[PDB]
Amino acid sequence: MKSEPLSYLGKDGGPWEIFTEQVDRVVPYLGRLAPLAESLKRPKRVLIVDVPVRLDDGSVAYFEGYRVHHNTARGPAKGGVRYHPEVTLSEVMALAGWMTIKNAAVGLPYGGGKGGIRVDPRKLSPGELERLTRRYTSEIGILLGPDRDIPAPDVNTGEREMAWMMDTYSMNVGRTVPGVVTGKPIALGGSLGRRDATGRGVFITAAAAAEK
Amino acid sequence: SEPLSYLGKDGGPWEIFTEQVDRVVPYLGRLAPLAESLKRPKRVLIVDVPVRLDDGSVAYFEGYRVHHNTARGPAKGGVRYHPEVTLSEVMALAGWMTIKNAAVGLPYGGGKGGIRVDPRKLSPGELERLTRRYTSEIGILLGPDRDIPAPDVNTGEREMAWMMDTYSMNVGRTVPGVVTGKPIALGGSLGRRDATGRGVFITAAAAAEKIGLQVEGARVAIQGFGNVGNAAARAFHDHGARVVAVQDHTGTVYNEAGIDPYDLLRHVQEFGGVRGYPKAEPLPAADFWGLPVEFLVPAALEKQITEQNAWRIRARIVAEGANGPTTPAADDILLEKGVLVVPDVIANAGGVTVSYFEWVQDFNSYFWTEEEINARLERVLRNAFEAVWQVAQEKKIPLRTAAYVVAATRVLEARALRGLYP
Amino acid sequence: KAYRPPEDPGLWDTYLEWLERALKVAGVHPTTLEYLAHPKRLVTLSLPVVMDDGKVRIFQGYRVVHDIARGPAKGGVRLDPGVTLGQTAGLAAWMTLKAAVYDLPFGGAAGGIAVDPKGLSPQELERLVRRYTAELVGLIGPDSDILGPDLGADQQVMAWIMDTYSMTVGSTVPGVVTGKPHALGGSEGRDDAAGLGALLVLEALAKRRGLDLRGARVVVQGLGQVGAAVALHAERLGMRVVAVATSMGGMYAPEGLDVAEVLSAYEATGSLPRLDLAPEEVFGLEAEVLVLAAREGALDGDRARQVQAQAVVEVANFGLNPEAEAYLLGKGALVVPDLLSGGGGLLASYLEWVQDLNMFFWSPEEVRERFETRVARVVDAVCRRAERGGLDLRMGALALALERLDEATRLRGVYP
Amino acid sequence: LKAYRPPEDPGLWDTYLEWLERALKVAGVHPTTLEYLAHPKRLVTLSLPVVMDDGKVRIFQGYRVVHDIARGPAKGGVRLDPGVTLGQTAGLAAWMTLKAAVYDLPFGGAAGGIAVDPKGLSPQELERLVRRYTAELVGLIGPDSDILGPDLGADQQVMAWIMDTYSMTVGSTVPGVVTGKPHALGGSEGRDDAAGLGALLVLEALAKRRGLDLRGARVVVQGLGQVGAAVALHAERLGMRVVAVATSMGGMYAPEGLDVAEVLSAYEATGSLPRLDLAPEEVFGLEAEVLVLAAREGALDGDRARQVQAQAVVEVANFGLNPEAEAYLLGKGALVVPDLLSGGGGLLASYLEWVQDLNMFFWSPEEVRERFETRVARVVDAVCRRAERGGLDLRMGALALALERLDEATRLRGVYP
Amino acid sequence: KAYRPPEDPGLWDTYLEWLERALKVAGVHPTTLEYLAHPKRLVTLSLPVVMDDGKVRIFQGYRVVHDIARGPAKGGVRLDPGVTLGQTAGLAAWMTLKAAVYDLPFGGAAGGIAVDPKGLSPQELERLVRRYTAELVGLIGPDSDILGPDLGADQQVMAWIMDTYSMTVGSTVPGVVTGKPHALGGSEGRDDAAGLGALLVLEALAKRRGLDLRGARVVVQGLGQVGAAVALHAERLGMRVVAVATSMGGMYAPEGLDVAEVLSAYEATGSLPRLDLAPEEVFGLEAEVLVLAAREGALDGDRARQVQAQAVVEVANFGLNPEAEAYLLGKGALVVPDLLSGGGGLLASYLEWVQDLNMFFWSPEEVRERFETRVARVVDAVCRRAERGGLDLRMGALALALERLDEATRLRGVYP
Numbered sequence A: 001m002k003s004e005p006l007s008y009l010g011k012d013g014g015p016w017e018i019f020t021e022q023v024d025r026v027v028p029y030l031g032r033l034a035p036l037a038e039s040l041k042r043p044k045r046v047l048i049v050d051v052p053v054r055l056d057d058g059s060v061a062y063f064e065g066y067r068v069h070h071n072t073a074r075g076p077a078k079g080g081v082r083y084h085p086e087v088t089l090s091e092v093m094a095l096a097g098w099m100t101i102k103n104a105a106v107g108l109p110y111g112g113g114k115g116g117i118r119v120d121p122r123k124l125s126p127g128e129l130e131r132l133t134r135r136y137t138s139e140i141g142i143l144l145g146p147d148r149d150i151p152a153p154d155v156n157t158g159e160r161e162m163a164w165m166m167d168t169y170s171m172n173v174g175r176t177v178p179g180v181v182t183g184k185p186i187a188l189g190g191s192l193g194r195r196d197a198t199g200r201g202v203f204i205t206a207a208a209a210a211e212k
Numbered sequence B: 001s002e003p004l005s006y007l008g009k010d011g012g013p014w015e016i017f018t019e020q021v022d023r024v025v026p027y028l029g030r031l032a033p034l035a036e037s038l039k040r041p042k043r044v045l046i047v048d049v050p051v052r053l054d055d056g057s058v059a060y061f062e063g064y065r066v067h068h069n070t071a072r073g074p075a076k077g078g079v080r081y082h083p084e085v086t087l088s089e090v091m092a093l094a095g096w097m098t099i100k101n102a103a104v105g106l107p108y109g110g111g112k113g114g115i116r117v118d119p120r121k122l123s124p125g126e127l128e129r130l131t132r133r134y135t136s137e138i139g140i141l142l143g144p145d146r147d148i149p150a151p152d153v154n155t156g157e158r159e160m161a162w163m164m165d166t167y168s169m170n171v172g173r174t175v176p177g178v179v180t181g182k183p184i185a186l187g188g189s190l191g192r193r194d195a196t197g198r199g200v201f202i203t204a205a206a207a208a209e210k211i212g213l214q215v216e217g218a219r220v221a222i223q224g225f226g227n228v229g230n231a232a233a234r235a236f237h238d239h240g241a242r243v244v245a246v247q248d249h250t251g252t253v254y255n256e257a258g259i260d261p262y263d264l265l266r267h268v269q270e271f272g273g274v275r276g277y278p279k280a281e282p283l284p285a286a287d288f289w290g291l292p293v294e295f296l297v298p299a300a301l302e303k304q305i306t307e308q309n310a311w312r313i314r315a316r317i318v319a320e321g322a323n324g325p326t327t328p329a330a331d332d333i334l335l336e337k338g339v340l341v342v343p344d345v346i347a348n349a350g351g352v353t354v355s356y357f358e359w360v361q362d363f364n365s366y367f368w369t370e371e372e373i374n375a376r377l378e379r380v381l382r383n384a385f386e387a388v389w390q391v392a393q394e395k396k397i398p399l400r401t402a403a404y405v406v407a408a409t410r411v412l413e414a415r416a417l418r419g420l421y422p
Numbered sequence C, E: 001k002a003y004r005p006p007e008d009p010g011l012w013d014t015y016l017e018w019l020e021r022a023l024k025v026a027g028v029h030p031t032t033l034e035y036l037a038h039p040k041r042l043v044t045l046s047l048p049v050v051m052d053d054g055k056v057r058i059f060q061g062y063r064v065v066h067d068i069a070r071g072p073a074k075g076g077v078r079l080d081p082g083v084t085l086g087q088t089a090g091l092a093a094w095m096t097l098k099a100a101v102y103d104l105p106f107g108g109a110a111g112g113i114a115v116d117p118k119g120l121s122p123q124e125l126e127r128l129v130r131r132y133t134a135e136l137v138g139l140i141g142p143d144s145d146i147l148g149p150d151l152g153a154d155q156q157v158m159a160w161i162m163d164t165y166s167m168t169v170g171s172t173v174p175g176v177v178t179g180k181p182h183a184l185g186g187s188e189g190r191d192d193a194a195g196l197g198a199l200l201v202l203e204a205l206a207k208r209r210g211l212d213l214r215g216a217r218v219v220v221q222g223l224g225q226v227g228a229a230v231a232l233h234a235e236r237l238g239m240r241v242v243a244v245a246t247s248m249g250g251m252y253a254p255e256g257l258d259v260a261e262v263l264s265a266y267e268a269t270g271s272l273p274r275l276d277l278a279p280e281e282v283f284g285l286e287a288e289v290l291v292l293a294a295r296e297g298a299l300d301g302d303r304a305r306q307v308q309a310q311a312v313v314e315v316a317n318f319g320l321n322p323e324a325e326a327y328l329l330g331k332g333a334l335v336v337p338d339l340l341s342g343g344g345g346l347l348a349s350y351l352e353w354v355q356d357l358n359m360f361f362w363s364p365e366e367v368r369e370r371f372e373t374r375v376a377r378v379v380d381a382v383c384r385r386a387e388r389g390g391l392d393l394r395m396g397a398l399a400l401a402l403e404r405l406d407e408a409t410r411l412r413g414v415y416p
Numbered sequence D: 001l002k003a004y005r006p007p008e009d010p011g012l013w014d015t016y017l018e019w020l021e022r023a024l025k026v027a028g029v030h031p032t033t034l035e036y037l038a039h040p041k042r043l044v045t046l047s048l049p050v051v052m053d054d055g056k057v058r059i060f061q062g063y064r065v066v067h068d069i070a071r072g073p074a075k076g077g078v079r080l081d082p083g084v085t086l087g088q089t090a091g092l093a094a095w096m097t098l099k100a101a102v103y104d105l106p107f108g109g110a111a112g113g114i115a116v117d118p119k120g121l122s123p124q125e126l127e128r129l130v131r132r133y134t135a136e137l138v139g140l141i142g143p144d145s146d147i148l149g150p151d152l153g154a155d156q157q158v159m160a161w162i163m164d165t166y167s168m169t170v171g172s173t174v175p176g177v178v179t180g181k182p183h184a185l186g187g188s189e190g191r192d193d194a195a196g197l198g199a200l201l202v203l204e205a206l207a208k209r210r211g212l213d214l215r216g217a218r219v220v221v222q223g224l225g226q227v228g229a230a231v232a233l234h235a236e237r238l239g240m241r242v243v244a245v246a247t248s249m250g251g252m253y254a255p256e257g258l259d260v261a262e263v264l265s266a267y268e269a270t271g272s273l274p275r276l277d278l279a280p281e282e283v284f285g286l287e288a289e290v291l292v293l294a295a296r297e298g299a300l301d302g303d304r305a306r307q308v309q310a311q312a313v314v315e316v317a318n319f320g321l322n323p324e325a326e327a328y329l330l331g332k333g334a335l336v337v338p339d340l341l342s343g344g345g346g347l348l349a350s351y352l353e354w355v356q357d358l359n360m361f362f363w364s365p366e367e368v369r370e371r372f373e374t375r376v377a378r379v380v381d382a383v384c385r386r387a388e389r390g391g392l393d394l395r396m397g398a399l400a401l402a403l404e405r406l407d408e409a410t411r412l413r414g415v416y417p
Ligand SMILES: CC(C)C[C@H](N)C(=O)O
Pocket: B070, B071, B414, B415, B418, B419, B420, B421, B422, D164, D168
C-alpha cells in the first residue's frame, strides 16, 4: 500500500520536499533497511499551538507556535526554537528532519525536533518577549522533558530565552530541571566550551581527514 | 495576530467557521474584544499513524486531533475516518463543537479528530490497529477531564470500544468516560438511538408554545426518514400531531388523514425508502415544500431549503433535524414570511446531550433508566431553547443568530472570568 | 484451558467445572473462554510485621485479579489460616461471575492473608493489614482493583485499608475499599445486606413457584454477619426460625426462636445458649427452608439425602456441593444458587462505591429502594434466561453471566 | 491540656482551645483524638513575589493551614485582608474541622489567607497575587486534598482565578479544587446568598421548635456584606422588621422597619448607608428581639453584651460573639445561636457545589434549594437532639456532636504513618 | 524590606545584617534582594508518634526553603530541643549563601524537630523521623528539597529518611538525603569532610600569606565528628594540637596532644583522659590557630578579647558573631569565616548526591581528589573577589555569593 505525501502542506514544494529528497538519495545505500526509509518521511508528531500574550498596551496578541518531533527512534527529540516572522510549519518540519539526521550522524542519543514562533522579536519589548517564551513553554509542556524533548537556541533565540524556558518548565513541574533545555547560561546549568565548540570541531574533523 | 499561515490562502471550511464568528461580534457587548480568541484553535496535534497491514507491510496515515477552545471544559468531539480529511476541516469542525457545546449548555469546550483513510480499503483487523495506534498517539491529550472523543463519519460503537480499551490498558485503569458512543456493555448510555429525533420534537414543541400553536392535531412534514426523521415522526405522532408528508431520496408520499410512522418505517426498512408506500399517494418532489402544515422537519441533506423553494413554505415552524438544511437567502425569506426556524445547533443537539449524559454516568458507572434520560434530555433542550428565545427577543434577531450569540457569549464569559494565564 | 493452581485447586476446579457445563448452553467465543480460564494476575506477598515482642514475623498474602472485561476488579480480603492462592483464584473467578449476574460494572478479584486473626494482638493485626495494603498501592485504586470485606475482615479492617491507602497516596480516597464504617464513607448500613439480599431473592422466587413463606420454618446454617442477618430478617418477615447453627452444633426450637436474644448471647459469649443438635443433624430438620450461610463445602452429596427442606438457599460461596445440588433438583426442591442469593454484599458494595465516588450519600430509604429494585431486576433476568434455555437457576445465571462477559470481551478485543 | 502554640496573634486559636476543653468534659473523646485536635497537621507560610504595576517586585505573605482531615479532604476559605496572620488562620482551620463535623460533611478543616489590602492593589496586581498563591499551593491542594473556598476579601472572581491557575498548572479542567465559583465555571446556584439564607433557616427552625413566632419580630443586622445583606433581605421576606443595619462605619436605625431594598441599593452603589444614625458600637444596645452578628470576629465583647436588649442573638460570622458575652447572654436568659450552627450556610452551599463538580452534573435552582433546606433542618434537629440528651445549650450540643463524629473517625482510621 | 520570624530571629537577623553589608560592595538587583529577604516557604508540622507506653505524643517540626535560584533546595535536619522556626529560617538562608560561595547548584533549606533525641528510645525516635519524612514526601525529592545531617541527626537518621521516602514512593531514591551510611549510597568522602575542609581551607590561605603551619599550635573548640576530624587532620599535616575542648572544659599539652589517643579515650569513656582547662580558658591559650568547631554563638565580643591566636577558623555556623570578628580583624588576626571553612560537609554532600544520581561510586581516592580540587577553587574565587574590592574574606565570599545569586535570579525572572 502507498503512503501518500503529507496532505497538510499543499501541492508544493518547499523545505520539506528538499528534506525528503535527501532521504530518497540515500535509499539505494540502505540494504535490508530500505523498506523502513518511508518512516523518515513522516514526522512522529506535529503540535501547532496558539500563543496568546498580553502586550504592554494591555491588549492581547496571538502568535503561531510550533513544536515538531520528526523522529524519536534513537532518543528524545532535540532541536532549537526559531523566532522569525517568516517561519512556516513546513520549514520547522524540514529543520526537525535535519536534526534527526545531524544527531544520528555524530551518534548522539537523540531523535530530532524543532520549534518556531512566527514573530518579529525586534518588534517586541523584552517584557513581552518573556511572556511569549513562557506561554509557548507552557503550551508545549505536554511534550517537554529531559527524556522526551529538549529545546535549544536557534535563529533569534539564545541564553535569555533558554533561561526563561528552563524556569517556566521547572516552576510548572515543581522541581528544578536544568536538562529540559540546552544552550543555557552557565549560572543555570550551562556548559563550558560552547563558544569555541564548532570552530574547534571544524579543526578536529579536518585533522582527522589529514590523518587519513 | 495575522491570519493562520499554515492554512495558506486556502481557507475553505475554517473561513466559513471564522465568518460566522465575525457575524456574531455585533452582539457580544463588552465581550467583543475577546472574540479573536474564537478564531484561534488552542491546539492542533497532527500525528503519524503507522499500521502493520495484514500482508506484513507498514502503511502510514495522517491523524489529527484539534482542541479548538477549552474555556468551558475539556474538549469534546468525534473522530472521523475519511480519505478527504484535511487539517482545515478538522479545525472548522472543532470550532463548531465549541459553539454547539456552549449553545446547549454542556460543560465542554470543542474538539475533533480525523484520520485521513478510506476505511473500506482496510480489513476489520487493520481498522482496529489503526484505531488503537491513533488513540495511543493522541494519548497525551486524552482523558475524562481533558479530551473526550466520540463517533463521527465512518466510526461508531466498534471504534469507541477500541479507544476505551486502549486508553484503559495504556493507563492501567478502567476509564469508560474517556470517550462516548460506546456500547452499553462497556458503559454507554441508554436512549441514544432516538435522542436527536426526540430533541427535534422537544425543540419544535417549545417553539410551538411561544406562538400558541397546538401540537395535538397539527400537521407535520418531514424530509428524510433515517434515524432522525423517523424518531422525530414518532415523537410527533405520540403527542397527537399528524404526519402528512415524508420526502426521501426515493420520492414523496402524502396523506392528509395522517401516515402512521411505525407503519411507514416497516415499509422503509423493507423497500429502502418511501416510494410506493401503500397507504399514501405519490407527490411531486417540488410540491412537498408548499404543503399546508404547521411543522416542517428537514432531516436529510444540507441546502434543501433554498431561494428556489423558500417562498412556497406554509409551515409555521421549521425545526432543523439535519446540519445546515437551509441557506442564508432562505433564512432571509422565511424571516419575512414570519416562519420560526429552530436552528440545527440546538434543534438536533439531542445526540450530543446524551453523549454528555453517558459521560456523567461514566464518572461512577451508575446508569440511568431510559425515562430518566428522556426527562433530563427535555430539561436540557427546553432550557437551551428558552435562552436562545430570550436573546432573540432582547436583540431583535432570528433564532439561528441568537443561538450563536448565546454560544459565543457563554464561551467568552468563561474566558473573561478565568483570565489570561499563563 | 486452563490455568492450573499449584496447590489447593478445589475452588478453581469447581469454577472450571461450572464453566464447562455452561459453554454447552451459552454463546461464548473461544477468546472469552481463554480469558475466563486464566486469571489476569496472581500476587503472592511477603508481609513483614514487627510483633509486640519486638521480633519480626513474616506473613504471606495474596491478591488475584481474574478478569476485568466488564470493569475494574472488585473483590474481598480474607484473614484466615486456610487462605491459599488456589482458594483466592477460585473466589476471584467466582466474583467475576457473580458481578456479571448482577449486571455490575466490575471484574472479579480476591485476596487473603494466611493468619489466624484471633491469635494476634489488635496492634499486630493493624500492622499486618497496613503492610498488606501498602505493598498493594500500585496495583489497586478506585478504578483499578477495589477491595472489600470477607472472612475475618470486617469494617475495622476496611478502615485501616482505607486509611493506609489514603495516607500513602497522599489524598483521601474512599473508593479503594468497600464495607467501610459509616463514618468513613460506608453504609447504609450493612454489612446486613448479604442476608437481606438472600431473603429478597428467596422471596421473589417463592412468589414465582407458588410456595408458603407465610409462617414457614427456616433453618440457618452459620451465624456470622451473613447468617445472623438472614435469621434476623427471616423472623421479622414472618418466617419461623426453628434452628441456627455454627461450627459447634445447632440450637433448635420447633415453634420458632427468639433470634435477637440468641445473637445477643452469641455475641456475648461466642457460643449458643443451648446445643440441641450435632453440627450435621441441622440439615435433616423438618423445615420448609434450608439456608447455607457459613462456609464453602457445607453440604455434600451424602448429607443432601437427609434434607426435607423444599427450598435450599445457598448464600455462602460454594456452600452447596455440585453433587448435593443435582440430587435436590432431582427431588424437586427449589435450589437457589450463591451466584444469585449471595450477591447482597456485592450489590451493597457497588452502591457504596457509587456514592463514595460522587461523595454524596443517599438516605437509608433511598439505598433500600435502589437495592431492592436491583435484586428484583436480576432475579427477573436469571429466570428469563433460565426459561428460554429450559434451565435450572444456576445454569440460567451462568449463561446470562457468560453472555455479558462474552460481549464485553469481544467488544474490547486483545490489547496489548 | 497540651496544644500547639501559635507564635503570633493566638487569639482565635485560644478560643478554639477553650471550647475544646469545655466540650471535652461532656463528650467522649479519646486522648489520641484530643492530640490530633490540638495540633494542626500542617501550617504553611509562603513568600509571594509579585511584579507591581510600576515593574518593581513586592513580596507578600500568605498562609495555608490544614488542621485535621480525619473526616475527609480539607475544606477552607481564603482571606485577603490586612489582619491575616498565621495565628488566626490556625484558629479558623480548626473551626472549620468542627463546623464541617456539626454539618456532617465529609470534610476536614483548613483555612488560608494573604496579608493584603485588596482594595489597595490594581486588578492586575490582585490577580497576580492570587495566581501566585495558588501556584505555590498546587502540590498541596486539589479536589480531594484541600478544597479552597471564599472568605473576607475573596470574591467569586478570586475563586475563578484560583480554579484557572490550578487547572492550567495541572493540565486538566478541575472545577472542584475551589468553591464559591461563578455559576459559569462549575459554580452552584445563587448561593452564596447561602450564608444568610442559612442563618435565617436555622433561626426559623429553632423558633418553630420552642414555639415562638417571628411575624413582626424586630431584627438588628450587624454587618452588610454578602452575609448581612442576605440576612437583612431574608428576614424582610419572612415578615420581620429589620430595624437597623450597621457597617464598620455606623448604623442606620428605623424603629418601624427599614426598607431593605432602599438601604442595600444605596450601599451597593456608594459604600455608605442613606443616613448614619448611630456610631457602629451603639447598634448592639438597640431595642430589638433579634441581634444578628454578620460582620467580623470579636464584634460583641463581654461589656457591650451588658447593653443587649434582644432576646435572640444569632452569631453568623465566625467568633462574632465572644465567650465572655455568650456566658452573660445565657445568664440573662437570651437564646444564643452559635456560628457552628447558624454560620454554616456558606459551607453547606460550598459542599453542594463540590458534589456537583465531582461528576459535572448541575441541579436546578429549585433542586439546590430543596437539598440545601433539608440538610439545614437535619443539622438543626441533630444539634438540638444532642443538646437535650445531655442538658446543654446549642453551642455545647453542637460541639458534643462534632467531637463524637471526629472521635469515631479518628479512632477507626488510627495513627499512620 | 524583610521577612520577620515570629519566634526566634537571632540567626535570621544575623543573616540580614551580613546581607545588608554585602549589598554595598556587590552589584545586586532589587528583585534579587526581595527573594533573598523572604524565604520561599516555611512549613510547620505536627508529628504524631505512638510512644513505647502506647500513648500518642505529638512533636513539632519544620522545613523551610529559603531560595532556589541556583538549583534544588539543600539543607540539614536538626533533632534538638532548641529548634525553632526562626533558627531553621536563619540556617536555610545561610545555606543559600554557603552553597553559592561553593559554586554549588543548590538553593538553601533547613529542617528540624523540637526533641531531645537522647530522651527517646530508638523505636520512638525512628517513628518520629519516619513521620517527619512521610509528612514531607510531596515537598521533598532528589530535585526539589534534598535533606542531610545536622545537630542531633546522624547517619542512622539519614537511613530512616531515605527508607521511609523510598517505601512511600515505590522506588529506590538515594538522592532524597545526604550524609547516608556507606551501605545505603553514602559517600566515602566522608562525614569527616567538615574537618578536612576546614584544614584544606586553612592551609591554602597560609600558603598565600606566608604563615608557617608545620609546628603551629592549634586549639580545637568542640569534639564531635567535626572537631575530632579537625584535630586528626591538623595533626596529620604536622601541626601541634595543644588543646581540645568540650562543654565540660579542655585538655592541654604544650607539647601537643596525642590526638588519636585522646579521641580513643573520648569515644571509649565519653570523657577526655584529663581536664586541665575550665570551659572559659579554652580561647585564651597561647596558640597560632583557634578552631571554632562546635555550636553557634561560641565566641562573642567579650571572649574575643581573650583570643591570642593569629588565625581563627569558624567552622560551626555562626561560631563567632559579627562583633568578635570586627575586633579580631582590628587586631590583625586572620578570621576564616564559616561560609568558607567548613563548607566541607556541604561539598561532600554534593559529591554524595552526584554519585547517587547516577549510581556509580568513586574510590576513597577519587572522592578525595575531586574534593580537594574544589576547595582549592573555592578559596581562589573568594580571594580573587576579596582582592578586587579590597575586602576582608567574609565580605569577598559574601559578594561572590550575592553576585552568583543575582545572576541566577535575574536570568530566571519572576514566574508564575
Ligand atoms: C481556559 C482559558 C479560557 C484561559 C487560560 N487561563 C488561558 O490563558 O488560555
